[PDB]
Design a protein around this ligand. Structure first.
Ligand SMILES: O=C(O)C(=O)N(c1ccccc1C(=O)O)c1cccc2ccccc12
Length: 282
């Protein structure tokens, strides 16, 4: 039971300790391809790399590298591609991935600029009339419409394969109110955002995996994936109270390092799941 485990830890300030156990137990696999000199400019951060076993490969024979990991949750039957906020030189790669993997949605959990510096390139067009063209991966992207709201914005985009002239509609789910430091006071809006993403059908099997990212694609992105999955499991099992969030986090960490960067995010994850649970039924 987590609802209880929560308070047991809160009034004991053991969050930092728990988080560390998880850090210690977490798996570690090689990232040999990510470290090759030729991909130095394909990584935003030197110490956030995709393991080789689970990395997303680009269908180009030149350089199939991109800092992106496939997180496959067998039991919950859900997959997610967690990636880093793209770089000024990897946007064409990013959309190539979205195309090749047949993704339907892109979930963005950060802003282009935070704490005064760029945390992600401006990879999507901001004005209907100014479409972007990525010449290296031969892709065209057009802003079709956007719906700006209190805590988030949803955009409909048209991605076209210039080689084939085939078009596809991608939904951009951009959470715009994640705080500069710390985590939200209330998981409330984050849960609404999540459900909003589920509702679009972007997390569904008939589509390629959803593309999720913040700046490094492991902290906030981790809380998103960890919350979704845990909620899905509490919904699928005979015994809902059998869902161990730490267990799930560790399973996800087999596919990508550092998912959930601080003890705060972990606490927040608990909160989002606990809150989301008291609502998936009434
Ligand atoms: O982008 C992330 O994965 C992330 O969650 N980061 C954070 C790390 C600690 C506390 C808060 C956050 C946050 O995003 O709110 C990171 C932000 C910027 C650079 C990072 C570099 C490596 C790992 C995590 C990073």
């Amino acid at each position: 039971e987590m609802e209880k485990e929560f308070e047991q830890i809160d009034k004991s300030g053991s969050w930092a300790a728990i988080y560390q156990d998880i850090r210690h137990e977490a798996s570690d696999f090689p990232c040999r391809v990510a470290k090759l000199p030729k991909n130095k400019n394909r990584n935003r951060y030197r110490d956030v790399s995709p393991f080789d076993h689970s990395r997303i490969k680009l269908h180009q024979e030149d350089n199939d590298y991109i800092n992106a990991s496939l997180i496959k949750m067998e039991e919950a039957q859900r997959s997610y591609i967690l990636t880093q906020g793209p770089l000024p030189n990897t946007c064409g790669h990013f959309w190539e991935m979205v195309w090749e993997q047949k993704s339907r949605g892109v979930v963005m959990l950060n802003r282009v600029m935070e704490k005064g510096s760029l945390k992600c390139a401006q990879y999507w067009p901001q004005k209907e009339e100014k479409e972007m063209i990525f010449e290296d991966t031969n892709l065209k992207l057009t802003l079709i419409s956007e719906d700006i709201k209190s805590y988030y914005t949803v955009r409909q985009l048209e991605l076209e394969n210039l080689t084939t002239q085939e078009t596809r509609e991608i939904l951009h789910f951009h959470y715009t109110t994640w705080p500069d430091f710390g985590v939200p006071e209330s998981p409330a809006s984050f849960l609404n955002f999540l459900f909003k993403v589920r509702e679009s059908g972007s997390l569904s099997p008939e589509h390629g995996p959803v593309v999720v990212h913040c700046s490094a694609g492991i902290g906030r992105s981790g809380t998103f994936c960890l919350a979704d999955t845990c909620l899905l499991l509490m919904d699928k099992r005979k015994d809902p109270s059998s869902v161990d969030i730490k267990k799930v986090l560790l399973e996800m960490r087999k596919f990508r390092m550092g998912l959930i960067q601080t003890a705060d995010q972990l606490r927040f994850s608990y909160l989002a799941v606990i809150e989301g649970a008291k609502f998936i039924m009434g």
